[PDB]
Each structure stands twice: as structure tokens, then as C-alpha cells.
Amino acid sequence: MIYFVNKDRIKKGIPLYYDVKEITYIATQDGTVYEEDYEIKNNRLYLNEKYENHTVTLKILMTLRYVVSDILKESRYQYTKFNQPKSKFENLPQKLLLKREDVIVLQDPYKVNDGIEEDLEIQ
């Protein structure tokens, strides 16, 4: 993606079309840019005053996302009876036709974290 900077966007912060996980490469007319000159907060980008009327471009990595645009071969069924006290009904897997999120982008959902440390020693 590419954005054009002006005296107003420098202070507000550039609103990004995509979400952000990490940045691969930044550049402008004066060359590349280092970590000391730019920062990102709440999925918008800030720059120092050196690039008031410069252009900026970014190669960016973002999480894969999908939405369900149709449900296909939607229900498959089995009266499972073998090795059961009584007949039981089980819904077999649905097939989904998924669609990517480009025109409108929302941030990753706010999952509730667990306090269990990952890769925890036990004794």
C-alpha cells in the first residue's frame, strides 16, 4: 500500500486501509525508514516532521480472515444406533463457501486470555 502525507495527516496519524501484524519494509523518496522515526498505535501510523510532504509506502503482513458468504451441502445426518442405549441423531460436517475481508476490515476479536503460562514446567 501507499499513502500521501500532508501537514494534517502527520499529527492525526495515517489511517491504514488494512490491519497490522508487523511491517516488512518502509520507503519514501529519501530512501528507507528506520524504527526511530515511525510508530504505530491502534492501527494508525505516525511519522516525524521530516516527511511533511513526502510519500510513504509499506509492505505489510496481516492475519488471514474470512466470512461465510454461503452455506453449501448444509446438513448431513446419521441416526447412530450401534453401541448406544438408544437411537441418537448427529449432525455431520457442514461445507462453507468463505469470502475474504478486503472492502471492510475489522480488527482481530478481543479474546479473553488465560493466566496459564504456556510451556509450563511441572514437578
Binding site: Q29, D30, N53, H54
Partner: protein
């Protein structure tokens, strides 16, 4: 009592001068050798020198000529606000 000040760049382009003749180039041939001259800065073979146009190729032969003196012609407009009391 300069309350506030601002600067603006209108044009920023390169212009070449002959060291001995004191003239400014205006025209070149197919080989890019000088054909004409002027003694007027306002009429010269201007090379754009804004941010986008740096590192040109049209005038490499012209640049290497030792008889020519590049000049960075820059035009500015500066706004100054004065508060002079009552």
C-alpha cells in the same frame, strides 16, 4: 515583532553557467552539446530538481562538461505576521 513565520518553495531547478563566457545554456543538439546561450536567468535550460525528479538522465553528458557550472535556482515565498501593539 514577528508573531509567526512560514516559508514556501515555489520552484527548485538546476541551471548551468559557462565558467568563462558567463552565459546560461538554453538549447542543445542531438549529441547534447550546447547550441545556444542567453544572458537571462528567466530563460534557461531548466532541469527540474524537486523531490521526485532527482537523479535524472537527460543531462549526463552536459553535467560532466568541466566548462559548465551548475546552479540551484530556488524560488521562495515567506509569510511574516507582525503584532505591533496598539
Amino acid at each position: 515583532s514577528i508573531e509567526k513565520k512560514e516559508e514556501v518553495i515555489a520552484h527548485n531547478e538546476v541551471v548551468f553557467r559557462s565558467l568563462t563566457q558567463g552565459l546560461y545554456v538554453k538549447e542543445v543538439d542531438i549529441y547534447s552539446d550546447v547550441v545556444s546561450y542567453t544572458k537571462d536567468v528567466d530563460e534557461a535550460l531548466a532541469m527540474p530538481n524537486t523531490i521526485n525528479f532527482k537523479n535524472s538522465r537527460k543531462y549526463k553528458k552536459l553535467i560532466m562538461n568541466l566548462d559548465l557550472e551548475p546552479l540551484n535556482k530556488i524560488q521562495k515565498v515567506i509569510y511574516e505576521t507582525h503584532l505591533e501593539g496598539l
